[PDB]
Design a binder for these strands. Structure first.
Lengths: 58, 58
DNA sequence: CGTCGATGACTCATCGACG
DNA sequence: CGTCGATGAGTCATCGACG
């Protein structure tokens, strides 16, 4: 029937919306996680710049 | 009058879908640039270890 | 209260894939 | 060809904001 198809499409449409939100969430967690690493990597670089300017003494 | 509102809503729905897409594009751009920046900060940290392990000569 | 635009949910129009 | 599920678009339900 057309009633049955209309009902299968209602689930298809909600599944489509769902994985749109799922995609938004992965992307947002990805940038959250790259920001953390950015800061990790950038402070380390900083800690290593000081080790350089302190070893070039003597 | 029903017609006119139905038309104004068609435009609102279009605007809604478009800024969902604009949101996805900004999110993917952010990931792209944080990635490239990570690469930059990680190669730099790596080059700085080697200045350290070579200023470590005495 | 009615009316606005925004947005989630429902429905319709198409799509490519399948047989 | 008819039929499937996926997805963009149109439509309906409902929201908070306005006045």
């Amino acid at each position: 029937k057309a009633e049955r198809k209309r009902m299968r499409n209602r689930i298809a449409a909600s599944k489509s919306r769902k994985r749109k939100l799922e995609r938004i969430a992965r992307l947002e967690e990805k940038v959250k996680t790259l920001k953390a690493q950015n800061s990790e990597l950038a402070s380390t670089a900083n800690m290593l710049r000081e080790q350089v300017a302190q070893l070039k003494q003597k």
